């Protein structure tokens, strides 16, 4: 077994999540004759820390309006996810785990509607699988 240390805040959050499915990330730095794990927020103290985030675009073609479709998507997701979502955001946005879903207008084209979604790799695989499942079949 490899002995390493864990930041107290990360362990507290992990225990709180476990008490009341979610998996914990891991980020470690090789140290002098030892290894230590550190959270993403705490790792920024090493400064530099230039953060880069991917934001993939999901394109859909439908004549229905935005806000009502967003409400329908929220209802469908909260039904599928077995009520794992018990939080909301003020600007009509619903978030699951660590992925943000918000309504954004396109750049210049009025004839096409495009939204922006950002996620990490662990969230990227789940998001890709869920989008493929949605594209497989829906009451459309």
């Amino acid at each position: 077994s490899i002995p390493v240390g864990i930041s107290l805040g990360l362990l507290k959050r992990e225990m709180a999540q476990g008490l009341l499915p979610r998996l914990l990330h891991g980020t470690l730095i090789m140290k002098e004759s030892n290894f230590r794990l550190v959270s993403s927020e705490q790792a920024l103290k090493e400064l530099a820390e230039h953060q880069l985030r991917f934001t993939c675009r999901v394109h859909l073609h439908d004549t229905r309006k935005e806000q009502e479709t967003a409400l329908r998507v929220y209802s469908h997701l909260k039904s599928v996810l077995k009520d794992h979502c018990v939080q909301h955001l003020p600007d009509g946005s619903v978030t699951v785990e660590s992925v943000l879903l918000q309504a954004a207008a396109p750049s210049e084209d009025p004839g096409t509607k495009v939204l922006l979604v950002s996620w990490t790799y662990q969230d990227e695989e789940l998001g890709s699988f869920l989008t493929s499942l949605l594209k497989k079949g829906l009451p459309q």
Partner: protein, 119 residues
């Protein structure tokens, strides 16, 4: 509410006066405002004039101000806050996601007229 028109504001003022609590920082006023907003949110076909929209916006702003902070008068993740209710247990105020209620009210308003970071 649609038939009454501008009478909703007068009814709310009369209810507040009857309650013997002029200040709207009480949790009861915020709960009543949220309940009034959900009724309008449920029916998206109820068009209202400019005065009604302005009154609704003012009521929503007052409710949000009350919910953000309340007076201390006495006589896997989630979001919530804390406050002191007027003569009742704090757990009695069963209100979930006031910001979502404001978002739904804005959505209903937009639906009537067909309408770095994330926001």
């Amino acid at each position: 509410v649609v038939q009454h028109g501008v009478g909703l504001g007068e009814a709310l003022l009369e209810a507040e006066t009857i309650e013997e609590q002029e200040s709207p920082v009480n949790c009861f006023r915020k709960l009543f405002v949220c309940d009034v907003l959900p009724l309008i949110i449920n029916n998206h076909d109820v068009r209202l004039p400019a005065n009604l929209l302005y009154k609704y916006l003012n009521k929503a702003a007052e409710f949000y101000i009350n919910y953000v902070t309340r007076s201390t008068q006495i006589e896997s993740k989630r979001s919530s806050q804390k406050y002191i209710i007027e003569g009742l247990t704090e757990k009695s105020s069963q209100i979930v996601d006031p910001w979502e209620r404001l978002f739904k009210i804005l959505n209903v308003v937009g639906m009537r007229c067909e309408w770095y970071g994330d926001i």
